Amino acid sequence: QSMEPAAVHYQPASPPRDACVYSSCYSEENVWKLCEYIKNHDQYPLEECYAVFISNERKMIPIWKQQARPGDGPVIWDYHVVLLHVSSGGQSFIYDLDTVLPFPCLFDTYVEDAIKSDDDIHPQFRRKFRVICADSYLKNFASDRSHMKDSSGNWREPPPPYPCIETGDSKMNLNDFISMDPKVGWGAVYTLSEFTHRFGS
């Protein structure tokens, strides 16, 4: 036997998975919409929440436990975005609308099963994490979806059913979030081990 505050009665910050606004291959906007819900629902301080971009320099990251590939294999994304809630006791939860893990999922469980160790992964596939305060994300993110069009301008995947997210300052800055260069964009950039050291139990 081994003993471990525990958030055993944790109440989710979002509606259940199937009630959330969601478009396949627009995880940056799915997470934005979760941030918007949290802001307007007055249950948790927005400052407890973070958008988390996952990518790397070659824009090829494996993620396991993904709905797009049922089974034990990874999806190789160019980038993927999830929501992190650091609950007030310190236990973190991951909200990934694309995972087959629970929604939400305990942080440690998400990193062990969906992310896995980088130790034995070929180095050009290793994961980095850009962590942006949810308030800063809502204030600064903009995407005109121009990255989801083919060479003739037609959609590669159908867009979300609402107008493009834009700010007063920009209509497209998605590359500043996918970038893992800490000299670019908002928030903090972590290696996988730095990320787990910072938020893990």
Side-chain angles (χ1 to χ4, degrees), residues 61-137:
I61 58 168
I63 303 290
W64 284 266
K65 302 294 199 173
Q66 284 278 291
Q67 302 170 1
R69 298 273 200 261
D72 310 331
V75 172
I76 309 308
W77 286 115
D78 51 351
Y79 69 97
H80 186 46
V81 181
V82 299
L83 175 85
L84 166 72
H85 179 210
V86 182
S87 69
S88 58
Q91 183 51 246
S92 290
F93 294 84
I94 291 289
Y95 292 73
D96 182 3
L97 285 164
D98 279 298
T99 191
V100 306
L101 291 167
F103 180 88
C105 182
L106 289 158
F107 180 88
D108 285 355
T109 296
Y110 191 86
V111 300
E112 307 172 5
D113 286 9
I115 301 301
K116 303 185 165 199
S117 177
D118 262 349
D119 293 330
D120 58 346
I121 285 178
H122 173 71
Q124 296 174 122
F125 290 120
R126 289 175 172 165
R127 279 64 55 86
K128 288 185 178 153
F129 297 80
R130 180 186 289 274
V131 181
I132 302 101
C133 175
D135 186 67
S136 178
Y137 193 55

Side-chain angles (χ1 to χ4, degrees), residues 6 8 25 34 38 55 93 104 108 143 146 174 181:
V8 297
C25 289
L34 290 177
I38 292 168
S55 181
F93 294 84
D108 285 355
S143 178
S146 63
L174 173 64
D181 179 354

Side-chain angles (χ1 to χ4, degrees), residues 7 18 24 27 39 42 56 81 93 99 116 120 147 158 173 178:
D18 293 342
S24 173
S27 65
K39 173 168 168 179
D42 300 312
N56 56 19
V81 181
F93 294 84
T99 191
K116 303 185 165 199
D120 58 346
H147 64 297
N173 61 15
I178 296 166

